[PDB]
PDB file of C-alpha atoms and ligand atoms in Angstrom:
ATOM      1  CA  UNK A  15       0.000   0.000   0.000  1.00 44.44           C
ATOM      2  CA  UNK A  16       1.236   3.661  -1.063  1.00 45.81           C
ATOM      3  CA  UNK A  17      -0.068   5.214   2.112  1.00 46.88           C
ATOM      4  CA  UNK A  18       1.315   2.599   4.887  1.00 49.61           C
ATOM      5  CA  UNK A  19       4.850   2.412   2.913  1.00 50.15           C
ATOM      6  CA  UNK A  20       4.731   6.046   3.100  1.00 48.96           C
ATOM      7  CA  UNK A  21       3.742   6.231   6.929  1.00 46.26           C
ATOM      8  CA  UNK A  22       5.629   3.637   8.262  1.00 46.75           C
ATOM      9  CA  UNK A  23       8.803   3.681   6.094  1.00 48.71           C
ATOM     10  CA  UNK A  24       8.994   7.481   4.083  1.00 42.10           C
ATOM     11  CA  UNK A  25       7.980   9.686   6.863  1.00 41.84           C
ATOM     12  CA  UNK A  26      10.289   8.595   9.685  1.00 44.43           C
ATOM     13  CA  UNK A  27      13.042   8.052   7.400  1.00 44.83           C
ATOM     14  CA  UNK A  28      12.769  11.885   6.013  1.00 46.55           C
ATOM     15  CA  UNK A  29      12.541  13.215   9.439  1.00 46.08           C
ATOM     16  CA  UNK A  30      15.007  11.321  10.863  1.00 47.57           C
ATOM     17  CA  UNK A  31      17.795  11.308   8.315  1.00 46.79           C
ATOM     18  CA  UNK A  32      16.538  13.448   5.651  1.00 46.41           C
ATOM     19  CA  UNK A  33      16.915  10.780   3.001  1.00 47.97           C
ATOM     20  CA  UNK A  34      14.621   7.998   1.689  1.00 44.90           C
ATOM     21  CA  UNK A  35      15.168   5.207  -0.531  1.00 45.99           C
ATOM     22  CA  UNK A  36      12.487   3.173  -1.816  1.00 48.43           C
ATOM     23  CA  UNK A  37      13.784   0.278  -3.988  1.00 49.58           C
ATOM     24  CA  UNK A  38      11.347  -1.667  -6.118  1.00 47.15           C
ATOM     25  CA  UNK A  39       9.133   1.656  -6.466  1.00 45.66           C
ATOM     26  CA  UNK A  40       6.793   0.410  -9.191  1.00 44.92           C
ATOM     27  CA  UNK A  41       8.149  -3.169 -10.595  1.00 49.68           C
ATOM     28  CA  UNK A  42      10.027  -4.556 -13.103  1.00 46.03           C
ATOM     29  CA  UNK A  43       7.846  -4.271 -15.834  1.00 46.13           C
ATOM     30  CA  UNK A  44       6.428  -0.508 -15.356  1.00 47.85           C
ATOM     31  CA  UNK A  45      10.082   0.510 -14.892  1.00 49.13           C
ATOM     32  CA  UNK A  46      10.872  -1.015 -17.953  1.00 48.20           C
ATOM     33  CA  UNK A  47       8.176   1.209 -19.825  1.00 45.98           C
ATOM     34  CA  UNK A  48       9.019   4.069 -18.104  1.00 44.45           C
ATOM     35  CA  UNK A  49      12.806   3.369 -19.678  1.00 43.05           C
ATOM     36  CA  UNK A  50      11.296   2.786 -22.909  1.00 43.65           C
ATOM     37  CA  UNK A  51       9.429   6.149 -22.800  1.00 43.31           C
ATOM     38  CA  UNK A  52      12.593   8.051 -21.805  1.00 42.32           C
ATOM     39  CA  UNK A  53      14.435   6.415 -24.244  1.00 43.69           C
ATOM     40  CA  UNK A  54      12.196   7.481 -26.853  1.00 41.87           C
ATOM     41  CA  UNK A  55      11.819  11.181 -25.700  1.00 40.78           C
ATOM     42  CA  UNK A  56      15.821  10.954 -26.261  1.00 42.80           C
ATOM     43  CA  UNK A  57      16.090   9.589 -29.607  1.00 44.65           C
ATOM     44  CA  UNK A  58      13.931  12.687 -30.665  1.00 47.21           C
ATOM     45  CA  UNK A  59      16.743  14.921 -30.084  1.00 46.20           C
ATOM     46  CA  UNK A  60      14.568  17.408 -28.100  1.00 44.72           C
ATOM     47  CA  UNK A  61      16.784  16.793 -24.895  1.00 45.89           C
ATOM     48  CA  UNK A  62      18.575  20.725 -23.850  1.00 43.00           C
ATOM     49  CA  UNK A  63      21.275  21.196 -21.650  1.00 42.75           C
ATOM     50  CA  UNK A  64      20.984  21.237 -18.084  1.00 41.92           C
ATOM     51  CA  UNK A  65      19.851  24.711 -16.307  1.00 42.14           C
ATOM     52  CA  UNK A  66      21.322  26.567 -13.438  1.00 43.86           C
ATOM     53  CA  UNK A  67      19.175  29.245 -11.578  1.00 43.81           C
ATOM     54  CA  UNK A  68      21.853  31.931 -12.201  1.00 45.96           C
ATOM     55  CA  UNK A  69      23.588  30.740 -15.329  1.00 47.97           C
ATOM     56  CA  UNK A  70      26.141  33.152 -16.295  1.00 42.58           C
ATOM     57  CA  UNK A  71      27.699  30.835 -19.495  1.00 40.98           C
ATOM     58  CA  UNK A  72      25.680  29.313 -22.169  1.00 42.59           C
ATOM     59  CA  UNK A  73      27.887  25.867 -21.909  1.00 39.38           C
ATOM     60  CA  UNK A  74      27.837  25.286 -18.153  1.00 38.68           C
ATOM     61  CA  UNK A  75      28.757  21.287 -18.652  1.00 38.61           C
ATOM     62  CA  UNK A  76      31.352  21.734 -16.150  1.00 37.42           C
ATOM     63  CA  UNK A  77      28.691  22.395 -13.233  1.00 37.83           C
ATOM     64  CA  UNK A  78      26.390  20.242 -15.023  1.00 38.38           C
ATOM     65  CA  UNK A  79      26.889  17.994 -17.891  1.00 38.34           C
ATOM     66  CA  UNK A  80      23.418  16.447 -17.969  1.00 42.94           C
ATOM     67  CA  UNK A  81      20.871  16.871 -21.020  1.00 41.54           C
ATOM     68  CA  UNK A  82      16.976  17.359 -19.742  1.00 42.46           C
ATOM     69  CA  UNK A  83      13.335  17.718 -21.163  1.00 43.59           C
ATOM     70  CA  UNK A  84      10.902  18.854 -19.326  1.00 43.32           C
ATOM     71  CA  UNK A  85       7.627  16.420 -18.766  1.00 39.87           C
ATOM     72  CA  UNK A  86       3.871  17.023 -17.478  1.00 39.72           C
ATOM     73  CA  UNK A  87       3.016  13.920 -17.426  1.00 42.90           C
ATOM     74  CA  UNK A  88      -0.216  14.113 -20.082  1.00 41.91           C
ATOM     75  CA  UNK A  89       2.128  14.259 -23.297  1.00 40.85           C
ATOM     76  CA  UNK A  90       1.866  11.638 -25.888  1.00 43.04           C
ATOM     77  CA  UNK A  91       3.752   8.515 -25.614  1.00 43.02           C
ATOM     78  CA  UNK A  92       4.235   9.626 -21.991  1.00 40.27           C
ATOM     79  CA  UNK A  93       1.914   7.486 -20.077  1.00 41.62           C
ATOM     80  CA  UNK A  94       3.546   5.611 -18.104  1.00 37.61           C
ATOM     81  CA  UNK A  95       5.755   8.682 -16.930  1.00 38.00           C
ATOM     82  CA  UNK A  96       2.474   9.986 -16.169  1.00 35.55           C
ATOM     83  CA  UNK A  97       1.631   6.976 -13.989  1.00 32.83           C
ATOM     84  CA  UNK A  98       4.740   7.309 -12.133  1.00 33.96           C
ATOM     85  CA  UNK A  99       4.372  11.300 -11.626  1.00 33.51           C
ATOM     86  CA  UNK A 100       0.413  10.162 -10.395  1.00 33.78           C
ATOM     87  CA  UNK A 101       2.091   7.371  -7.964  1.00 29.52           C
ATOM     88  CA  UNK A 102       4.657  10.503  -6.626  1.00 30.66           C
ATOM     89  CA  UNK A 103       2.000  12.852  -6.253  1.00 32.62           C
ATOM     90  CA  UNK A 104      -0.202  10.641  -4.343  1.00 34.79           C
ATOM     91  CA  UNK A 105       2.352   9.091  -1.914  1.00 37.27           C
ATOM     92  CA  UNK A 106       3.325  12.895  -1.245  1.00 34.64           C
ATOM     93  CA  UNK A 107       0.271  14.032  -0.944  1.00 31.13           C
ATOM     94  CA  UNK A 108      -0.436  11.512   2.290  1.00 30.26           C
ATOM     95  CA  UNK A 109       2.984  12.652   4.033  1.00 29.20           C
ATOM     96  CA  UNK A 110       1.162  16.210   4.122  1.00 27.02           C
ATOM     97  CA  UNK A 111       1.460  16.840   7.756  1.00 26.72           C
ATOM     98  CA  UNK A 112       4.019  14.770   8.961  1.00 25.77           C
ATOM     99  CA  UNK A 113       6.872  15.944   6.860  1.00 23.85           C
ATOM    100  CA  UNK A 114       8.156  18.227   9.693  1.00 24.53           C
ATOM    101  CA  UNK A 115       6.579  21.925   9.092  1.00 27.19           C
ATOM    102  CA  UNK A 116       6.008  21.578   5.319  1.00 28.06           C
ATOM    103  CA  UNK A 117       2.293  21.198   3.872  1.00 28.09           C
ATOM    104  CA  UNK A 118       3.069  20.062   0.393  1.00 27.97           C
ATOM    105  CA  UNK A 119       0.623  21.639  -2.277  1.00 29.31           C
ATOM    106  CA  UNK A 120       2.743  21.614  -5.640  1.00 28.15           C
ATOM    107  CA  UNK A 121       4.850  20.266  -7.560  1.00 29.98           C
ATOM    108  CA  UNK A 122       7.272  21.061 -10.887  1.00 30.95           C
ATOM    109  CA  UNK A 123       7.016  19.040 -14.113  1.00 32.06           C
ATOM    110  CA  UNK A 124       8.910  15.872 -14.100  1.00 28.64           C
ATOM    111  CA  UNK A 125      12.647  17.057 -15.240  1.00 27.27           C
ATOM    112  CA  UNK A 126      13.640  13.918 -17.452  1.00 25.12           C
ATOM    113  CA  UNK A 127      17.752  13.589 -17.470  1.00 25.23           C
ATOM    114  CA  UNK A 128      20.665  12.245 -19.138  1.00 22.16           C
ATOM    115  CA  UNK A 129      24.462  11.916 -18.696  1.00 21.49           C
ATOM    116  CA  UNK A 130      25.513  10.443 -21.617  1.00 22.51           C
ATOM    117  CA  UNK A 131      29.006   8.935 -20.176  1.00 24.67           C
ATOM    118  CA  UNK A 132      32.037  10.422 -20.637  1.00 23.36           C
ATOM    119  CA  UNK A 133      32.914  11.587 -17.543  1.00 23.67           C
ATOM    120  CA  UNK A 134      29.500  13.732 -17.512  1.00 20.43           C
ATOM    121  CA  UNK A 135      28.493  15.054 -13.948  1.00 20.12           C
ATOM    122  CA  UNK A 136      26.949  17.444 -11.488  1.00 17.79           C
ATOM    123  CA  UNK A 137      29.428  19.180  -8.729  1.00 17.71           C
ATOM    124  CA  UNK A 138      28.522  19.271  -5.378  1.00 17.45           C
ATOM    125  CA  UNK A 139      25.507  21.998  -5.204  1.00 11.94           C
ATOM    126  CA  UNK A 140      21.918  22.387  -3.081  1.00 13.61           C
ATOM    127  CA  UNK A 141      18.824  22.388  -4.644  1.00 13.37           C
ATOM    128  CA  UNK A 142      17.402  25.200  -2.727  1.00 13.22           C
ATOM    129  CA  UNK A 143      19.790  27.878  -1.955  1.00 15.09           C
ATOM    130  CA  UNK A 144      17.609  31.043  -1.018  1.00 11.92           C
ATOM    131  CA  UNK A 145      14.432  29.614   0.063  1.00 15.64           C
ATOM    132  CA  UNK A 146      12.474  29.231  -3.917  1.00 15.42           C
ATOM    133  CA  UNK A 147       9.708  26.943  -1.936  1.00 20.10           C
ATOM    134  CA  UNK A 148      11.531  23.923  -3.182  1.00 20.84           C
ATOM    135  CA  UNK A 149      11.585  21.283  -0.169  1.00 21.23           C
ATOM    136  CA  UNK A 150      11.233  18.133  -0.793  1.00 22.58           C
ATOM    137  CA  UNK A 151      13.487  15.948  -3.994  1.00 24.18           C
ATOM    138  CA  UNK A 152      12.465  13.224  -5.875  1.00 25.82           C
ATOM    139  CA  UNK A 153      14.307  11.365  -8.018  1.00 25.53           C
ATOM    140  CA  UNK A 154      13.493   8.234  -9.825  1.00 27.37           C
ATOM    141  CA  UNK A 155      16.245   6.043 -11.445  1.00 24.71           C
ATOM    142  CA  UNK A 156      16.077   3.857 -14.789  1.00 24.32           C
ATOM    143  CA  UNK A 157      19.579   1.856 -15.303  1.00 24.23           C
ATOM    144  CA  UNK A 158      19.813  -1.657 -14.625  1.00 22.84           C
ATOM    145  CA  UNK A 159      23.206  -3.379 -13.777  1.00 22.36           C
ATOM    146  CA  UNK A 160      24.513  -0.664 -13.114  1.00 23.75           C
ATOM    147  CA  UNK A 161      28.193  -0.791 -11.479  1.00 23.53           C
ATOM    148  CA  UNK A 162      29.517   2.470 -10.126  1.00 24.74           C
ATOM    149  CA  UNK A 163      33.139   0.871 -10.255  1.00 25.43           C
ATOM    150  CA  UNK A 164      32.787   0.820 -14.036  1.00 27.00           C
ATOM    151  CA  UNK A 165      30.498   3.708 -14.843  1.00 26.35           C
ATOM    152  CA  UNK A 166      30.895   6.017 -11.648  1.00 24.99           C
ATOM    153  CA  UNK A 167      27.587   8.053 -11.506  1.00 25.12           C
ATOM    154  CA  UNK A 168      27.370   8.156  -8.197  1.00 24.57           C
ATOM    155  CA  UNK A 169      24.827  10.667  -6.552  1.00 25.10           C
ATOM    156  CA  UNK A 170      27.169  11.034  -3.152  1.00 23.31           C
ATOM    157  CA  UNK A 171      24.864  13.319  -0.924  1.00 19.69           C
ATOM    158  CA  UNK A 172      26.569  15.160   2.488  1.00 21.83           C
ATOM    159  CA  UNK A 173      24.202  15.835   5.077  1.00 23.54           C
ATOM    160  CA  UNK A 174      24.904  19.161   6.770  1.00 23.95           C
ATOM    161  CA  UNK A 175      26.869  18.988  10.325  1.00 26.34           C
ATOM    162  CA  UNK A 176      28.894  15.926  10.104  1.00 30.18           C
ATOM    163  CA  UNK A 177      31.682  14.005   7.718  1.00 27.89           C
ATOM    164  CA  UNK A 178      29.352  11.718   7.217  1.00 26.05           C
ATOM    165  CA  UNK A 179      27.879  11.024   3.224  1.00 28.40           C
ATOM    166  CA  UNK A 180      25.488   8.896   1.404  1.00 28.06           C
ATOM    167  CA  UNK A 181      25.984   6.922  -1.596  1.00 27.71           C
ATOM    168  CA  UNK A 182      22.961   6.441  -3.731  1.00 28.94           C
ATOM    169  CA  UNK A 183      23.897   4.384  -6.643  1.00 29.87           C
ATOM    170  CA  UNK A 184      21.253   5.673  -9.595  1.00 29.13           C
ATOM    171  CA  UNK A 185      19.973   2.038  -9.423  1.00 26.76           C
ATOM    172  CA  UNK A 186      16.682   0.753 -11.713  1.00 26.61           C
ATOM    173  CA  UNK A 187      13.225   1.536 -10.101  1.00 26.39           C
ATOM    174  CA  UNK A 188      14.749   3.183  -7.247  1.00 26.61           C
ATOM    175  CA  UNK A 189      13.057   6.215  -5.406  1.00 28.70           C
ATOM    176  CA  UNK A 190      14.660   8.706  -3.679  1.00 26.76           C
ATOM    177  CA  UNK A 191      13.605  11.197  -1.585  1.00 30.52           C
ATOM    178  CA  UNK A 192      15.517  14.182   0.405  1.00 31.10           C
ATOM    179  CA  UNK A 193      15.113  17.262   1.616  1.00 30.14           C
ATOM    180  CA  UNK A 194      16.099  20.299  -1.220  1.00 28.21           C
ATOM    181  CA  UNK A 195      17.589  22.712   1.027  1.00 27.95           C
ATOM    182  CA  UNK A 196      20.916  23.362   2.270  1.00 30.57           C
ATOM    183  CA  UNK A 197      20.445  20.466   4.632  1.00 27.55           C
ATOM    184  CA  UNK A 198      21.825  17.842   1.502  1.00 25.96           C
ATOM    185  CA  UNK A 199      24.698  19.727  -0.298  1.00 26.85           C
ATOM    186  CA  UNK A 200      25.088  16.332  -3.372  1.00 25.72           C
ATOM    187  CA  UNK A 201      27.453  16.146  -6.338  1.00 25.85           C
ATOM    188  CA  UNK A 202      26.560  13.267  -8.825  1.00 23.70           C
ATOM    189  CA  UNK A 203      29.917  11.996  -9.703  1.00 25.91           C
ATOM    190  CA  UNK A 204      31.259  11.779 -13.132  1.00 25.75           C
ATOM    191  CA  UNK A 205      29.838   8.891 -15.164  1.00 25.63           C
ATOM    192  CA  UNK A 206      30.816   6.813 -17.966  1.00 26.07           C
ATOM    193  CA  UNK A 207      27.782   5.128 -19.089  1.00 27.35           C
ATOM    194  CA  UNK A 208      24.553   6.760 -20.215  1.00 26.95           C
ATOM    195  CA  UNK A 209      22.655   8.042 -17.017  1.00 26.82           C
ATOM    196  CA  UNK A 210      19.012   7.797 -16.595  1.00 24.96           C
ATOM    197  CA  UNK A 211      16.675  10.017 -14.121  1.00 21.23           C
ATOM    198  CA  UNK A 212      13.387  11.195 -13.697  1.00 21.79           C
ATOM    199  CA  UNK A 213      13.167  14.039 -10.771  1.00 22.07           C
ATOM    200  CA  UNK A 214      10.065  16.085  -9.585  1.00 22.12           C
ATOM    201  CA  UNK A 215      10.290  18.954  -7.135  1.00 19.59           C
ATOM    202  CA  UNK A 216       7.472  19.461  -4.585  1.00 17.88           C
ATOM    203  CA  UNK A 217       6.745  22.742  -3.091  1.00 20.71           C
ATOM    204  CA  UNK A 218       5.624  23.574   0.839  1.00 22.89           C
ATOM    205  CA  UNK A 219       2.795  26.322   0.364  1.00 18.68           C
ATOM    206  CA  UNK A 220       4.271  28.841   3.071  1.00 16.51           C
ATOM    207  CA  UNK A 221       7.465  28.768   1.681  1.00 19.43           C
ATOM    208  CA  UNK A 222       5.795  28.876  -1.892  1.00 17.85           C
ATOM    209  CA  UNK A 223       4.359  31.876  -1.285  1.00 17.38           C
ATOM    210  CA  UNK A 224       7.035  33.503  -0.031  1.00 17.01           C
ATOM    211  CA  UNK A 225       9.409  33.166  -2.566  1.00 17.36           C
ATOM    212  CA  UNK A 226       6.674  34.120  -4.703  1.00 18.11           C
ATOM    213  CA  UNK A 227       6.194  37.612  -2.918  1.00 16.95           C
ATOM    214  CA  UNK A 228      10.389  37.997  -3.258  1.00 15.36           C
ATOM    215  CA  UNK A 229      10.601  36.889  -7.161  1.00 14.24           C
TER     216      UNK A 229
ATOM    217  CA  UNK B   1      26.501  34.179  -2.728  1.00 15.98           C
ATOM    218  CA  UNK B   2      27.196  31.823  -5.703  1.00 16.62           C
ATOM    219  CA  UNK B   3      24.814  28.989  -4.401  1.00 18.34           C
ATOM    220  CA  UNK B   4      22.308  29.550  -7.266  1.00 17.65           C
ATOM    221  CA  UNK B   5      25.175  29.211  -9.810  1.00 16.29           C
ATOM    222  CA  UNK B   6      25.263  25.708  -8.803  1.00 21.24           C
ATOM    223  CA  UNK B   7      21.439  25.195  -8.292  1.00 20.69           C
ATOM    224  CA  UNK B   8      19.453  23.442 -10.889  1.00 16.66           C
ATOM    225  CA  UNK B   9      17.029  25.268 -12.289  1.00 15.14           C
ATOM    226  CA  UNK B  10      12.867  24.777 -11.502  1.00 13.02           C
ATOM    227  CA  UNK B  11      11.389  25.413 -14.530  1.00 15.30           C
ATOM    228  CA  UNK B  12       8.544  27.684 -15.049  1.00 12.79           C
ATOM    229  CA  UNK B  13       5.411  26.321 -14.245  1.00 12.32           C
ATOM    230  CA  UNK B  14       4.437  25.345 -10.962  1.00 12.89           C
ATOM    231  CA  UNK B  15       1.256  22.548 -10.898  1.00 12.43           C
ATOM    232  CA  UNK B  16      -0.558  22.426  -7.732  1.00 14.63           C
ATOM    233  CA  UNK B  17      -1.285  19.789  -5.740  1.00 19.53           C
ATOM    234  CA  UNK B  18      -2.650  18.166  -2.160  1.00 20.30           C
ATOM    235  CA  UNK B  19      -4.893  20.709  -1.207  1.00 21.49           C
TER     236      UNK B  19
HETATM  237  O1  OGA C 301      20.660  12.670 -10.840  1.00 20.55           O
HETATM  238  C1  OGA C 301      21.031  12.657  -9.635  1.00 20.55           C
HETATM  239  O2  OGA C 301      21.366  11.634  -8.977  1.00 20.55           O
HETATM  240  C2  OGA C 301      21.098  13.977  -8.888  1.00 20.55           C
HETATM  241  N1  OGA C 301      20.632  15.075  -9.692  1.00 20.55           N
HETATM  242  C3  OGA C 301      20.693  16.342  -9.218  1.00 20.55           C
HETATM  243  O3  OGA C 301      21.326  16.512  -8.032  1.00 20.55           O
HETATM  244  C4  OGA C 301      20.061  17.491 -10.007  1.00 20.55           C
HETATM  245  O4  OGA C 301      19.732  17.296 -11.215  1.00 20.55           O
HETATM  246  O5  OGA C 301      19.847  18.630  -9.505  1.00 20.55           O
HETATM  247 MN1   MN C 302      20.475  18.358  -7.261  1.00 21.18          MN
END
């Protein structure tokens, strides 16, 4: 059940460590159309490069070398992307009062990504530097057999306050969740296989608004 | 500071959700 895995397993997890991974999310088979979706959306050639909120170069590769295309979920050929977005949304949606202070009530489009090898990465950054209403991060991984001591692409995250890190290999039908703020400072590390992520953003109202009053 | 050079960016739309 979405609700008692989220409960039981999501909610103390985020609270506790600020990090959640859920592996198995959605089963073999859906993960494997998901990966045939995203495969698809990528053989179209519509994929851009990654985005920074203050870019100051048009080839940033060196902060992030990842190539992305934005997704609502209700595009053609985009189903199952939009079953897994519906599956985020409604897990999320029951944490609503128990993750900490936040009440959840948005969400961005689903930002499709690829590294495509060669030592492609993302250096060590926070999602939410300034308080943009970002607070919760979801990422959703699509690459089978995947062996970090052959194709690195490690996302190595480094919880605030202590030497400790976490190593979340960007294993097939894995879930992860974390807080977006400067709590989880994360690098992914340079890869040498083509990289395969779905993320989605969700947004705590308060903070929302906020940022929408000072932007 | 020079956290948002880092930052990825959010996109422009915004769809709500919950409540
Ligand atoms: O893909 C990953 O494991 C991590 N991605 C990011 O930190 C990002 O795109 O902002
Ligand atoms: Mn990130």
């Amino acid at each position: 059940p979405a609700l008692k895995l989220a409960l039981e397993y999501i909610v103390p997890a985020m609270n506790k460590h600020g990090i959640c991974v859920v592996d198995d999310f959605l089963g073999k088979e859906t993960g494997q159309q998901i990966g045939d979706e995203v495969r698809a959306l990528h053989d179209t050639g519509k994929f851009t490069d990654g985005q920074l909120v203050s870019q100051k170069s048009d080839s940033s590769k060196d902060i992030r070398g990842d190539k992305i295309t934005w997704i609502e979920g209700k595009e053609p050929g985009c189903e199952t992307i939009g079953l897994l977005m519906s599956s985020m949304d409604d897990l999320i949606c029951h944490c609503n009062g128990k993750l900490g202070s936040y009440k959840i009530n948005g969400r961005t489009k689903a930002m499709v990504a690829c590294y495509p090898g060669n030592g492609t990465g993302y250096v060590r950054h926070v999602d939410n530097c300034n308080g943009d209403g970002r607070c919760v991060t979801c990422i959703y991984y699509l690459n089978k057999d995947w062996d970090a001591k052959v194709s690195g692409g490690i996302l190595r995250i480094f919880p605030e306050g202590k030497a400790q890190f976490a190593d979340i290999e960007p294993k097939f039908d894995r879930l992860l969740f974390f807080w977006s703020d400067r709590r989880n400072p994360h690098e992914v590390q340079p890869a040498y296989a083509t990289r395969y992520a779905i993320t989605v953003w969700y947004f705590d109202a308060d903070e929302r608004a906020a940022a929408k009053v000072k932007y | 500071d020079a956290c948002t050079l880092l930052a990825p960016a959010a996109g422009d739309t915004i769809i709500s959700l919950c409540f």
